[PDB]
Amino acid sequence: LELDVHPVAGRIGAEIRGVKLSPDLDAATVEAIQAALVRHKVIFFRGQTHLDDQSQEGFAKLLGEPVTRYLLQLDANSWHTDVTFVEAYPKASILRSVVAPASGGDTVWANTAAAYQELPEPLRELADKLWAVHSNYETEHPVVRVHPISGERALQLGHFVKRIKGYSLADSQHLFAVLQGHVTRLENTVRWRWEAGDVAIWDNRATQHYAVDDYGTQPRIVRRVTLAGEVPVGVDGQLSRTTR
Amino acid sequence: LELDVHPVAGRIGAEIRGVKLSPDLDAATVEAIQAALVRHKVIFFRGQTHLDDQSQEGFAKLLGEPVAPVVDGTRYLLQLDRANSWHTDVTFVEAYPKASILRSVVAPASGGDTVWANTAAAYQELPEPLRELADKLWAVHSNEVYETEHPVVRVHPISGERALQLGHFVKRIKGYSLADSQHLFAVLQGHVTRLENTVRWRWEAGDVAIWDNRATQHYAVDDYGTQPRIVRRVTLAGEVPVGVDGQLSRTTRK
Amino acid sequence: LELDVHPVAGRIGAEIRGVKLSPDLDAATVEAIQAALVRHKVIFFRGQTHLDDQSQEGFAKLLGEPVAPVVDGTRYLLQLDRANSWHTDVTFVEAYPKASILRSVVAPASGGDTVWANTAAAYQELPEPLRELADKLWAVHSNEVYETEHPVVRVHPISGERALQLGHFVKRIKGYSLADSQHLFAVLQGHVTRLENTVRWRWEAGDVAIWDNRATQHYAVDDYGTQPRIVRRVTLAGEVPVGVDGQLSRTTRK
Amino acid sequence: LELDVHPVAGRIGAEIRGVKLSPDLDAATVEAIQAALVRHKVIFFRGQTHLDDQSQEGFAKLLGEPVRYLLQLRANSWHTDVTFVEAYPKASILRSVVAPASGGDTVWANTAAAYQELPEPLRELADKLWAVHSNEYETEHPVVRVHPISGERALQLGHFVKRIKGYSLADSQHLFAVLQGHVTRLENTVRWRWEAGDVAIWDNRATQHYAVDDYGTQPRIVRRVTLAGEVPVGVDGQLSRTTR
Structure with a gap:
């Protein structure tokens, strides 16, 4: 199954056209969505x-x-992967724009797997050995996570990092x-740049994001579902561990 | 005259609709464009x-x-076929350009973006003691062979807004x-x-951007690989910068 | 009264010879020691x-x-037997010590040094715009619980010399x-x-140092491994710092 | 032969007593001086x-x-001598002729101890780095040099470094x-702290040094002889190379 996929930037992000999201999508559509999410790290659906x-x-x-049971309404301008101060942090979020500022209010994502790949090989080999402590709870995660579906290595950092062990x-x-x-x-x-009815889904195992705070008092309301994730595994197979 | 202006981000950038750029634009149009440019720092026209x-x-x-090697048939048009580094244009000279007009000829299907930064907003958000320090600093800008000394804070000649004058040509703060x-x-x-x-x-063929080089820096995102990207540019002559105490920039080397 | 004073480094430190420290020193001697201390920021007495x-x-x-666990038979003497990090003493409180008197009891045969920095010289050497900025900054000091807000530039209450108040208890600049x-x-x-x-x-047993905590930082070098090092300290109460514009430090969490 | 050696700081520097330096020193004394130099990185002889x-x-x-070889000598910046050339000096012999009454110190750093104290993943990264050194002559040296006498690994950096390749x-x-x-x-x-007649000798393969400039116009006169050194060898046995 090939979706109508339109890459946004050169190394991350894709808009998917011709799909109306809903609880009734068939199993091939869902799998193609999950594949597009792994490959592109964040994917976008307009006009939902x-x-x-x-x-x-x-x-x-x-x-x-x-x-509703799980839908949270948000009415964060610092780079982060979600909730990394816990051990099995979310694998993904699904985020829908409900009220979007006429100007400003953007979200940016970064591809932490592409960031890892572009390091010179000696620096990749260092990163493969590093552990960091993440805190709001304190957890130790490898700096480099091996993705559980694609096996791509990704940098696991962002603003919850308190220090490199x-x-x-x-x-x-x-x-x-x-x-x-x-x-x-x-x-x-x-x-x-959000319009009401846009939906973004990202893979929180291989991204960070940042919400641009340039919109002053313009109202901005988004609604989020977060999906449960696995314990990271590092390059030598070791797992993350909460310490406090 | 009120153009059809649509701000892009909350602190810089606006798309102007309903205007077909050409050598025959009337005075009111040109003046409204010059006003939108000072206000929004970079402006965009699509579908040109x-x-x-x-x-x-x-x-x-x-x-x-x-x-004033240019595009055949023109006297001033330069073609750019990489500059992924933040900078204000040509600041190693004394009276560096006030603006460029940049047209997209061939645009990568993914990647290829250009980003502008508002150096006037950046100055205004500094805490007062830091603005006061910035108001006193001079930097040496170099192409390394030209070296020019500019104030770190430039008072814009039209708007009087103060803007940081930095970017990759800065060699050191004097x-x-x-x-x-x-x-x-x-x-x-x-x-x-x-x-x-x-x-x-994100450029599509036929997009044109114009930016105020006195109050911005820009960066071209190099994320598009071997996808062809071709843009053509005209640069406009600018004035010698004036700092907060009235002093002027000065070239110091060749 | 002129003491036998011998500068150690060009910009800080002096050994004073011909003085046996004790509770019975006459007032002229003590006054000349206090002046030496203000002037040189840390002074040294060997053979005590x-x-x-x-x-x-x-x-x-x-x-x-x-x-005010102290050394037995005293009220105020503290034994230290490691702090290899630059700091001014106890600056997480409001009226932190003005001085310490430190005696070497056991000195490693190699290693074990202490270093002091002159924060008044450090202030004076900054370029004027940067001194003017420092004159306006405040920093939050913390023990990692007490948090105190101090001006970055302290005007010394005896000499009037301005000195930077920083070091490892700084949590952030407000x-x-x-x-x-x-x-x-x-x-x-x-x-x-x-x-x-x-x-x-470099300490020998019987060395004593005295330093002016209002105008220094210090650092104990940890290069001596398991060689025993024992020093004993008395700390003297200080005043509330005063900034360049006359404002006073203030504790904000206790 | 055991010289009368008195270590100065915990991890570098030793004063050697009871030796009058001259062209007539015997082979055992010379060899014991060479061994002390390798061990302690910089050695001092007073009263010469x-x-x-x-x-x-x-x-x-x-x-x-x-x-024919003595230079009379401001260098308040950390460096290893002449590293912008490929076979830079192995040592210098420096004598104080006039010494300021206060100020005028020289400081040396032990680049072998500095290498050894790095966590192992960081040593492994340093083992792989090359830097360009320049007198702006440009030479590429491994960031870690294997000492040709002791085999001790040492960081080779200092103010001549223009960038890490x-x-x-x-x-x-x-x-x-x-x-x-x-x-x-x-x-x-x-x-x-120098007195007239003090001599220092340092192993420029495993140190950097810095002349403190805190003595104003007090006259300071030092005289130096520099000894020829070898081409550095990196951890994988590669040799430095001048490129400009």
Whole structure:
């Protein structure tokens, strides 16, 4: 099954046309959506005007287990992967624009698997050995996660990182600045300008995102379903572990 | 005259609809365009499929004086066929351009974007003591062989808005050690490129952008691989910058 | 009264010879020691082999009011037997110590040094616009619970010299993003620890140092492994810092 | 032969007593001086007031080949000597002729100890880095040199480094900042206060140094002989190479 997929930026993001999202999508459509999500890291559906609160939730249950029963309304300008201070953080979110500012209000995502790939090989080999502590709860995650479906390595960082384990504070900051800098390099990101009825889904195992705060008092209301994720595995097979 | 103007991001960038760019635009149109440009810092016109190389150049001349290997059949049009680094144009010279008019000829199907940053918004958001420090700094800008000394804060000649004048041609902040110069540059430049002070544009063939080089930096995203990307540009001559205390930039080397 | 004073480094530190420290020092001697301390920021007395726990404490009371597990047979003496990180003492509180008197009891045969930095010299060497910025900054100090807000520039209550108040208890500079706070800290702290503003002392048993905590930071070098190192300290109570515009530090969490 | 050696700081520097330096020192004394130099990285001889200019040079020829050879000497910046050339000096012999009454110190850092204290994943990365050194002559040196006598690995950095080969400018700055910051960590250094007639000898393969500029116009006069060094060898046995 080939969806009508239109890549947005060169290294991340794709709009999918010709699909009306709903709890009744057939199994091939869902699988092609999951494939497009792994490949493109964030995917977009425009004009989902029919998709009410109940129908977003039931569509979401097709893609994983949610963490109306699960639909949250949000009425975050710092780069982060979702809830990484816990051990088995979300694998994905499904996010629908309900009220969109006439100007401003964008969201940006970064492709943390492309960020990992572009490091020189000695620097990839360092990153493969690093562990960081993430805090709001404190959890230790490998800096490099091996994705459980695609096997792609991705950098696991963002603003919940409190420090890189086994380094002085100064060295931790330098190493984080280098690796996080590759994440948010413009070439690894896609920025989306929302219209009401847009839906984005991203793979939280291989992205970070950032909500641009440039819209002043213009109202902005989005509704989110989050899907439950797995314990990260590092390159040498070790798993993340909550410590506090 | 009120053009049909649609802001793109909340602090920079606006698309103008209903205007077919050409050498024959009337005075009110040209003046409303010049006003939108100062206000929004970079403006966009889509669907300019009629606008060829001669017509782009003639349109340009309505906005200022084009600056002199050019596209055949023109005197000022440059073709660009990579610049993924934030900068204001040609700031290693003293009176660097005030604007460019850039047309998309061939646009990658994915990738290829250009991002602009509002250096006036970036200056305004600094805490007061930091604005006061920025008001005093001078930097040396270089193409490395030209070196020019500009104030870090330029008072815009039309709007009087103050804007940070930094970007990749900055060689160092005059009067500081190297380490101090890098930290201070990193602070001020980081406000320029903060997402909130930027707009990103995804080009389609026939798009034209015009930006105020006195109050922006830009960056071309190199994420498109071997997909052909071809744009053509006319640059307009600008003035010698004036700093907050009235002093002027000055070239110091060749 | 002129003491036998011998500068150690160009910009900080002096050994004073011909003085046996004790609780019985006359007023002229004590006054000349206090002036030496203000002037040189840390002073050194070697060969104080007669100076035991009680007599260190009695000598200390001639300089100020010691601040309240102490060494047995004393009220205020603290034994240290590691802090290899630049700091001014106890700056997470409001009226932090003005001085410490530190005696070497057991000194490693190799390693074990202490280094002090002159934060008054560090302030004076900054370019004027940067001193003007520092004169306006405030920082939050924390023990990692007490949080206190101090001006970055303290006007010394005896000499009037301005000095940077920073070091490892700084949590952040008030009014700035985190990245900006980091850069600004790094610049100003970097002038503090520039080698030319420091003096390093290699201890022998019976050495005593006294330093002016209002105008220094210090760092104990941890290069001596398991060689025993034992020093004993009396700390003297300080005043509430006053900034350049006369405002006072203030505790904000206790 | 055991010389009378008194270590100065915990991890570098030793004063050697009871030796009058001259061109006539015997083979056992020379060899025990060479061994002390390798072990402690910089060594000091005080009270060498007999030692004039010709005598300094003749003493130096016992340690290696000078590059007729005494230079009279501001360099307040951390560096290893002449690293912009391929076979930079292995050592210098420096005598204080006039010494400021206060100020005028020199500091040395042990780049072998600085390498060893890095966490193992970071040593493994440093083992793979090359840097370009320039007198703006440009030479490419491994960031880690294997010492040709002791086999100790040492960081080869300092102010002559223009960039770390293969990295963007930002990454090069960060990685240099981490590795050079270990070099200049106080624990890895020794600061010497000079008296007229003091002689220092340092192993320029495993140190950097810095002349403190805190003495104003007090006259300071030092005289130096420099000894020829070998082409550096990296951990995988590759040799440095001049490129410009």
